[PDB]
Amino acid sequence: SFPALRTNALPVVTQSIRCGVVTLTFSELKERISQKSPKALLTYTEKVLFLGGEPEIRKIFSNDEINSIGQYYIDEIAQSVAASTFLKSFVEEAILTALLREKPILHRVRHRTHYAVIPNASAKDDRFLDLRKAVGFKGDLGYITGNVTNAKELSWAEAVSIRLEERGGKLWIMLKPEIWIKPLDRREEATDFIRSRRRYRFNQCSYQILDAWIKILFGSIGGGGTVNISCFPDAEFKAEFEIGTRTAFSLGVG
Amino acid sequence: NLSQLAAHSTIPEPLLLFKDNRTDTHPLRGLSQYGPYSACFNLPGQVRLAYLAPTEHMRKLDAIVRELQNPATPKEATNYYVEYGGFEKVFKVPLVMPQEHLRCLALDECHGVAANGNGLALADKIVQSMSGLFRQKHAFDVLLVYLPASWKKCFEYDGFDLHDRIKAKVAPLNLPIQIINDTALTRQCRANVMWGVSVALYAKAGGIPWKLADWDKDEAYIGLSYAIKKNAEGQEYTTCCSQVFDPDGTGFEFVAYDTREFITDRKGNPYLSYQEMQSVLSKSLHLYQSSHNGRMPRKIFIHKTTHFTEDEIQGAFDSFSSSTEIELVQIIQSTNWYGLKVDGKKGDKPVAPASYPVDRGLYQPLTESECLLWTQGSVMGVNQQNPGQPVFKEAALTPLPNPIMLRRFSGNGGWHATCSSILALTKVDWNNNTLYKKLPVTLVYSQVFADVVKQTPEIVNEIYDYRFFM
DNA sequence: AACGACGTCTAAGAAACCATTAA
RNA sequence: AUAAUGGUUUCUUAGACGUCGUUU
Ligand SMILES: [Mg+2]
DSSP states (O other): OOOEEEOSEEEBOOOOEEEEEEEOOHHHHHHHHHHHOOSSEEEOSSSEEEEBOHHHHHHHSOTTTOOEEEEEEEOSHHHHHHHOHHHHHHHHHHHHHHHTSSSSOOOOEETTEEEEEOOSTTOSOSGGGHHHHHHSSTTSOOOSEEEOTTOTTOEEEEEEEEEEEEOSSOEEEEEEEEEEEESGGGOGGGHHHHHHHHTTOOHHHHHHHHHHHHHHHHSOOOTTOEEEEEEOTTSSBOEEEEEESSOOEEEBOO | OOSBOOOBEEOOOOOEEETTTEEESOHHHHHHHSOOGGGGTTTTSOOOEEEEEOTTOHHHHHHHHHHHHSOBOOOSOOSSOOOBOOHHHHHSOOOOOOOTTTEEEOOTHHHHHHHHTOHHHHHHHHHHHHGGGSTTTTTOSEEEEEOOGGGGGGSEETTEEHHHHHHHHHTTSOOOEEEEOHHHHHOSOHHHHHHHHHHHHHHHTTOOSOEESSOOSSOBEEEEEEEEEEOTTSOEEEEEEEEEEEOOSSSOEEEEOOSOSSOOOOOSSSOOOHHHHHHHHHHHHHHHHHHTTSOOOSEEOOBBSSOOOHHHHHHHHHSSOTTSEEOOOEEEOOOSOOOEEEEOOOTTSOOEEOSSOOBTTEEEEOSSSEEEEOSSSEESSOOSSSTTSOEETTTTTOSSOOOEEEEOSSOOSOSHHHHHHHHHHHSOOSSOOSSOOSSOHHHHHHHHHHHHHHHOTTOOOSOEEGGGGO
């Protein structure tokens, strides 16, 4: 038999990564990251861990404080991600920054989850057209971003929430489309506007929206291929990721 | 393939049983076509009824009663609702109206009490007004209470519930009670309200509207749930309780206990130790033994919302004999997964998405200890319109169904039994007029009884049945 | 290494209110 | 409270870790 169930999970193929470890609490490291705001990612563990460039660490830490810098090999990335929560967030940021590189896609964070917002100024692009057909009614095209009626100084756009999960020794990336509301402190005022927007997004409409978002995020689907992405390809401590394009699916037993 | 998950399967549908042993998946359609299960035994031979209304609200009760007697037609939903033929036609039992000695009026001081905003005082006054009808316990079966909207101030606040308070206060006096608010009178579609109130009154008069078919006699299903009460001194009193569902010999049993049997006193994490778990499961074992004839359950399907600790697992394993297998599945609602339906190659077009969501009763095994179950989806054969279009119950709320997740802590083998049992237990609720519920009835009854117990600290310890809190 | 006492990360729930009414 | 569950925002709990201490 051929009934099919299609999920919103894409596989992650990389198993091990290399990163910088600096040898000399979490709150002070976060404070230093906030004040410095460098072009690198950092986290606190038994030893302070980072991914990026050495000058960023030089700005972060005084020259008399860094005892040494070494290379840490995080083998079996799924097990390490499952074991610790800090490594989960670090891999989150690494794979996401590798994903959203060299693309006209915004980036916003609410409730400790990551989104991929479509910019207002770059709404009328060629890549942003296949999503406008799925949002559109019948053969017409849909507005991918705009304003909300009876809501002064409050905009809206189409966004997708990106997460990562570990299930049985495998790493999956979760995609789920919502509508992003700016500013963030007044999202409730558009709640009804969201409902009336998604009231008629049935199986086929949601399927097409998901396919369009996958195309926008990756650029190529089909052929059983995978996309290689890079986070910070301008330093010794770089991240290289390989992500599948076909979403996880299943077929009936028959 | 790099992303091909494990093969999925479907368990078709629960089949409800009606009078003269007739199988029907549609509850309302089977009720209208066949008769209720209890009408075969004529256990509620006559559904007597009494009123309890403020000084001038008797007319609303009379009007809803007359609407219950007369037929009605569906207005809002049409692919699921069936025409309501009136109480006598569908349930074969009258609704003889209360006489002059059963149409009591509440004290005029109830409004004065509600003016200040004292929920406990108003509940006590309502119960005291009710107390005059305990003499005529043979003159009526179900009492109807109308709560006017003018009391809306004393309805819910700071963790207080008038509904649970009076349902617990009345419980020692063996008398089912039904509350009718302005919502039931004002709601535009009258067929739904009539169906719901009729089923509630018939089930609370001692009857069995419907019961599931193909149920194994030697099985048990237990579910625990907890409620949180904030104390003055920064405390988090967690009150847990349990509910079991028994097929018995020929009836239906739906009871619910309290865990605070002179033990526990948690005031902390919603988890119980070895002693508390053993004591709680001892009552379940005793009740299963007593309701049946000197026999133990051949299986146990204990469920709850949170996860079992190792001490809890040991207590569950030791509270029962070695001839029984205990599944300790945990139900998780919030999930980051969802699914979409894709149809196969039919005619000449390639694969395409369907116009309706994925089939209800479909499960996907992710790991060896976790699975996804679809309690929401498309049901076939429930369309009162053209009989080829599936029905999605929550199409007006969510455009797509949200799956539930099952995390097993014991057992082995496939997920057929657990998923089939959960989906079957989702349809046996009698308080709701829709097709099913998201969660199995054990969790929902445990949750509502936990709220009831938390509302009244001084709740007497005997075991109540479903009809007294439904 | 003696057992608290205090900070981060995550995953899960429960009160307490809003809303509309099945391609 | 005839009823279904979709949002929003808080709070709590449980794990995982770290840091002086502290006891001894
Ligand atoms: Mg009820």
